[PDB]
Scaffold this active site. Structure first.
Site, short mmCIF file in Angstrom:
data_model
loop_
_atom_site.label_atom_id
_atom_site.label_comp_id
_atom_site.label_asym_id
_atom_site.label_seq_id
_atom_site.Cartn_x
_atom_site.Cartn_y
_atom_site.Cartn_z
N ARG A 169 70.13 111.65 -28.72
CA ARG A 169 70.97 112.65 -28.08
C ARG A 169 70.83 113.96 -28.84
O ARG A 169 70.21 114.91 -28.36
CB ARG A 169 72.45 112.20 -28.04
CG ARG A 169 73.36 113.14 -27.25
CD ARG A 169 74.60 112.46 -26.65
NE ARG A 169 75.30 113.35 -25.71
CZ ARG A 169 76.46 113.07 -25.10
NH1 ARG A 169 77.07 111.91 -25.33
NH2 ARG A 169 77.00 113.95 -24.26
N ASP A 226 82.74 118.43 -10.38
CA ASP A 226 83.00 117.03 -10.10
C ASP A 226 84.31 116.81 -9.36
O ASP A 226 84.35 116.08 -8.37
CB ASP A 226 82.96 116.22 -11.41
CG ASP A 226 81.53 115.86 -11.82
OD1 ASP A 226 81.30 115.53 -13.00
OD2 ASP A 226 80.63 115.92 -10.95
N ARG A 242 83.85 117.61 -5.73
CA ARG A 242 83.10 116.59 -5.00
C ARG A 242 84.07 115.47 -4.66
O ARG A 242 84.08 114.95 -3.54
CB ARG A 242 81.98 116.05 -5.87
CG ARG A 242 80.81 117.00 -6.11
CD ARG A 242 79.95 116.54 -7.27
NE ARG A 242 78.56 116.97 -7.15
CZ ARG A 242 77.78 117.26 -8.19
NH1 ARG A 242 78.25 117.17 -9.43
NH2 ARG A 242 76.53 117.64 -7.99
N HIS A 282 82.89 115.80 -19.12
CA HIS A 282 82.05 115.88 -17.90
C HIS A 282 80.93 114.86 -17.96
O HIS A 282 80.01 114.97 -18.78
CB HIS A 282 81.48 117.30 -17.76
CG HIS A 282 80.34 117.42 -16.78
ND1 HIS A 282 80.47 117.11 -15.44
CD2 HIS A 282 79.07 117.86 -16.94
CE1 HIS A 282 79.33 117.36 -14.82
NE2 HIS A 282 78.46 117.82 -15.71
#
Ligand SMILES: COc1ccc(Cl)cc1NC(=O)CSc1ccc(C(=O)O)cn1
Ligand SMILES: COc1ccc(Cl)cc1NC(=O)CSc1ccc(C(=O)O)cn1
Ligand SMILES: COc1ccc(Cl)cc1NC(=O)CSc1ccc(C(=O)O)cn1
Ligand SMILES: COc1ccc(Cl)cc1NC(=O)CSc1ccc(C(=O)O)cn1
Lengths: 331, 323, 331, 331
Positions: free
Chosen positions: D105, D165, D168, D192
């Site tokens: 990451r 988000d 949606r 998120h």
């Protein structure tokens, strides 16, 4: 030889039929607010105006027209005769008589009925398939009268009901809380005016229940006195009439919002007055405000709000008063 | 704690300074029409309304605020005290008195120094009649450089003309082009040579255009533009809708720095044969600093002399008045 | 009881018919720019997309759909089957093949015709009354082709033609002049591309002829070489392509502008491509850009611009060249 | 004399400085969708685009420019050199390095840290007082990074977070319920991504709680499986990329909505990522999505949502893992 013909070669005979046409009935201060909000939001491709006051009619029509360079609604017309309203998708009624003193509620409302006996048939003749939106007060009852007089199904006869009051209660809600009304949520339902029910259970920002944060909300034990906000709402219209002689701007913007849902088939929910016999425990032929899904076909659905039994009681008491009244009208 | 405090945690202590604020001075039919058009085009983050009738003022504020849910202008204020106009980018003057001018001059003698004291850097947009003079009055009294003082002038009248143009030819006014310049009112100039669609000069198609011999009487069209205000007042008492829309159009060009050209009234000394401090309508470039450039319209010699005639006419009136 | 039925009482049975439906054909970058520009200008109450790339097609839909909170177009649908475009008011054609190496331009043109042969008859089937707007290149030819294949009247078949060229021309005009493009007026007429005609005699600001002010305007002996401004317009799609690999945004905004005049019946004048057999000294069956009144029935009139002699010959030459291409084609 | 001089007389010899300037950093599909959405909402008087891809940068600028006739944003500029972004009120960061593998990451992220180490300092140099709006993924981390490098105070650094988000979700809601997402309400908060927290408790239509109507809501025992709606939200970015190659339109529209609240000082409440140490139980310097009041000074206030003890610990975990990642970065 003419200038038009020298400049422009025509290739297509007229067949001019309006596509998204709106009519406002009555060019008092409310109607013209409705007119101007609608025109500035681009909701129609033709607006028609009607009233009995011919002079004021031609003048308003003319002023709006001189603004065309600044609009995108290519045609504006007006007149005494209702054939200028032909083929409306939406017909909005603001026509009223203003109460005398002594006159009395009942006789006032019967004169308005007298106006709808003349006005509604004419609209219906020229726009069989229009949706009707009544704004005239008292709104819940005059809407019922439009429904009765037009013979329209209940989904096509809408009352502006508690639309603006809710907006209002949200502006005040936002003033106290410090955020925009768009993000303050709360519903005022039932009969328009002082008998309206503020659903305190529903009030929230960001889905955060305010009655859970603050159980005393609205109740008489509330150190912050949130019932007075409803009060402010219910009183705010007379208060403005008191201060400027009438109200316009808010009711017009409010109507333009409704018109947008309708004309654009948005199926948004608005607190507006519909024929609710069957629902919310109401058994009379009465119109009240409940959350309605609104679209190109008028009211298609109703959101069933879980009311307490005191609230359910309130509405049920409006149904009776309303019906009592409507029962005494002469159609 | 208080419910607002249970609900919301403050993280910043909020320095409220309007960034795109607009003030409309006067809440008669005209000024309100300006307000409602401006709100609806999303032009200001703040609108202030000043007048002297305090109820009327307070009730117009309230009526507009109630519609906030449907607007994108988060703050609307009002009051007789001009502290409320503080920090306006644009101040629109619709104030006026029911001979007068000196009376209107007297009103401006009160309103304009107030406006200047609270918004040192605003643009002034005068709408009240007699508009070319009141615009001169405001400019003189304000101390502002000229680019920052605009008269609404022939803007609307040019809007009416194009509307009527487009009724005779059958295209939207947007595509009909024609300019009205000079003194706003009966003595304004219909510039025939610039009337066109798609760049097609009408006067070249039709040289009689605007002459008495004009079998199509397009001269009547200019007279109709010059009469319509009076005609509309005759019908409904006053006018509003079209003036508000045209003012918001000007508002738009200023607040977005569009640099559009409008027929508006500017201090045109040194241009068009003119040598007085007068305001007349000519094609002005209009942007964030008010009028920054003017189009030098090519005029017939009579038109040139009509403009000079209105300069001296306007000047002659102003020479009386005292400040 | 499902949450829905528990929450919402249904009062209508709906049979959805779209009232201001627009379709875009081809979700390439040109088509999607048309798509977004239209959704942001609230021109339609339903938007449908079609293409043959079934995946690209489903991604664009969802992606738009996901923006619904921010839009006022309630319904967005897509599909390879043209059933989804049914009852459109306006169908916009951005479909096309991109070249090989390799193949001739004539043969790239045919290939696009074979796409239209498949696409046009399908649109017609589900939207007999729609207006067709052709955007694909070469646009004058493919508009003719859509015309012949559709069997629509000439008013209802519109080529986007020189509408963007003219907007650019005006933008570049206002850069030279310090004025906004809104306030610069100038026309590019004729064929879309290297042979289009800058009508210098009509260029102006505030109705002030630049030509009269400066007689060299557009001449070779022009010290200010304004001609090069036309050249930039002709080359700008190219210059943009070298740079980013295609154009989209501008053509998309200009298509929405044409869409707004149609959907709203404004009757504005645009430099667009129309069947002009009969006017402008054109004796052939070809589409050329001329100023057209555009409304709810497409092109209803056209403005006759006084062309200089050198200019008539350009358009007649363009018409001969187009016709001769058009004859070498297989419908 | 020059044509421009014959035509126009200059009166003001005035300067530059823009009043409502917005900059977009990154002309990928996301930043361009942000660009067009902002330009059609009339949010700016000057828009600046910056990126390292010089051809692509200039290409997009020109394409936007050619649409000036149709926009009300007078000035569009682009440049590799950040002097072009000078004096922005809002700066939208959409820059990013693209995947390949070994996204330890703290590595594919480390290359975005390093892109930020170059960009943010250049942004702050020329726009000292601007608001920073970060959209790049991973958003909550990259927003923290932007925060540390710029040195801006927390109110002026904003992450787009769960704003899209939640929209949606509201959209999928309106699909299950049959109303517009405008009228459906629910919040997705926290980190998120897969670990974001759908606040079931706050989902509602017209103030009517769904979880109350239907207590299984969001749980596995939910026969309606509303849990898969949160999951479908989490996944939709992926699906869309899977279909069309990337996502643009919805992130572009939602970001322009945040832009709107900022530029207009609307103080609406959006689910966006703010530095929340001290609130919601979180003791580390991290950014999470909570309901934020968004205005001309960025994020000024935060709505404190009543959370379950599960939600709370879930937010804490996101806080601690974000922090775990941030410790591993190199500034
Ligand atoms: C006050 O009457 C109207 C107001 C607005 C509109 Cl658009 C139309 C009208 N009036 C009518 O449409 C004529 S029917 C009628 C019946 C009773 C009364 C009365 O009691 O004064 C007036 N008119
Ligand atoms: C008519 O007065 C006003 C109308 C609108 C506005 Cl915003 C402000 C005003 N008036 C003022 O601002 C007070 S100064 C003044 C001077 C003379 C007269 C007169 O001739 O009666 C009235 N006021
Ligand atoms: C390139 O094909 C298309 C682009 C956009 C749309 Cl909406 C539809 C299409 N294509 C079709 O609708 C199938 S018909 C066809 C004919 C010729 C060729 C060719 O020469 O390669 C391709 N398809
Ligand atoms: C590709 O990076 C960017 C994307 C969008 C914008 Cl606006 C700016 C940029 N990039 C830069 O601002 C240059 S700094 C940099 C650091 C690392 C990497 C890498 O690991 O590939 C690339 N560039």
């Amino acid at each position: 030889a003419a200038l038009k013909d020298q400049l422009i070669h025509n290739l297509l005979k007229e067949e001019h039929v309006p596509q998204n046409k709106i009519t406002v009935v009555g060019v008092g201060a409310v109607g013209m607010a409705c007119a101007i909000s609608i025109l500035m939001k681009d909701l129609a491709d033709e607006l028609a105006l009607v009233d009995v006051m011919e002079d004021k009619l031609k003048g308003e029509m003319m002023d709006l027209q001189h603004g065309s360079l600044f609009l995108r609604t290519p045609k504006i017309v007006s007149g005494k005769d209702y054939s200028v309203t032909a083929n409306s998708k939406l017909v909005i009624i603001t026509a009223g008589a203003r109460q005398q003193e002594g006159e009395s509620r009942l006789n006032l409302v019967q004169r308005n009925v007298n106006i709808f006996k003349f006005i509604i048939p004419n609209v219906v003749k020229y726009s069989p398939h229009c949706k009707l939106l009544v704004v005239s007060n008292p709104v819940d009852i005059l809407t019922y009268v439009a429904w009765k007089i037009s013979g329209f199904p209940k989904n096509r006869v809408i009352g502006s009901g508690c639309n603006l009051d809710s907006a209002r209660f949200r502006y005040l809600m936002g003033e106290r809380l410090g955020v925009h009304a768009l993000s303050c949520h709360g519903w005022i339902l039932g009969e328009h005016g002082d008998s309206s029910v503020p659903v305190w259970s529903g009030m929230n920002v960001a889905g955060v229940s305010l009655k859970t944060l603050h159980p005393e909300l609205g109740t008489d034990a509330d150190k912050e006195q949130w019932k007075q906000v409803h009060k402010q709402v219910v009183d705010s219209a007379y208060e403005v009439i008191k201060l400027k002689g009438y109200t316009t701007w808010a009711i017009g913007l409010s109507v333009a919002d409704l018109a947008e849902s309708i004309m654009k088939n948005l199926r948004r929910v608005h607190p507006i007055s519909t024929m609710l016999k069957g629902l919310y425990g109401i058994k009379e032929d009465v119109f009240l405000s409940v959350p309605c899904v609104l679209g190109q076909n008028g009211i298609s659905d109703v959101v069933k709000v879980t009311l307490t039994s005191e609230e359910e009681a309130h509405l049920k008491k409006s149904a009776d008063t309303l019906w009592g009244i409507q029962k005494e009208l002469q159609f």
